[PDB]
């Protein structure tokens, strides 16, 4: 139905040599994927709804001039977004970075009722509003 001289190719993609990443950056660097935990200073939620990948932090020395934050690894302030973790891990393997996986932690739904603020015998009765 889509005849274009199709060929079964079982082994996974090795686009590594195509990407141009240097050997030690494609080998030594370890990237982890995760859902970023929300800033506890905020109650907003729509920042833990994506799968972001980031790389291990490297040396950060202070230059002699003003004590700036000169670094050497270019892939330090590089974070990639992904809808589902499967896409992220596929990208990681096909690129060739050693990857680490953390499962999407989500808040457990707790039973909440205002009638618990008052009680006849339960300890849950509040003492101030």
């Amino acid at each position: 139905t889509q005849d274009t001289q199709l060929i079964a190719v079982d082994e996974k993609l090795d686009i590594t040599t195509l990407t141009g990443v240097p050997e030690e950056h494609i080998k030594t660097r370890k990237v982890r994927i995760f859902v970023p935990a929300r800033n506890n200073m905020q109650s907003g939620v729509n920042n833990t709804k994506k799968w972001k990948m980031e790389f291990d932090t490297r040396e950060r020395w202070e230059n002699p001039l003003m004590g700036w934050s000169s670094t050497a690894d270019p892939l330090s302030n590089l974070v990639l977004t992904f809808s589902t973790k499967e896409d992220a891990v596929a990208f990681a393997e096909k690129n060739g970075w050693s990857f680490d996986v953390e499962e999407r932690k989500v808040p457990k739904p707790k039973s909440k009722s205002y009638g618990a603020n008052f009680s006849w015998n339960k300890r849950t009765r509040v003492s101030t509003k």
């Binding site: 274009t4 060929i7 190719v9 090795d14 686009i15 040396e59």
Partner: protein, 115 residues
Amino acid sequence: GTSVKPIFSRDMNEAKRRVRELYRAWYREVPNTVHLFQLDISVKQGRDKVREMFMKNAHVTDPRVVDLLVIKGKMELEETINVWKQRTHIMRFFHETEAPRPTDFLSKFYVGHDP
């Protein structure tokens, strides 16, 4: 899934063929690019760099990837042949100003935090 579309080569044999005359062209090129570009490289130490770069991507086994390396080397060949490239870019493969990098774990520990 497993089924995919080729670029030119059908099987490892024909891509293996394409890298063959790519190395052909690089061999016949190296001496007269040394002559034309006034290279400080020598002929033998010109050829072995080509050989080592060809051996660098030894692990590749996907066909389409092999067509990609061969066409990129083709672009490299055009860039070199008609003097669009410059002598500095030709030297770029040879790492002169780049200081030698240690390999053993002990030297890595001595230098600084790095895997």
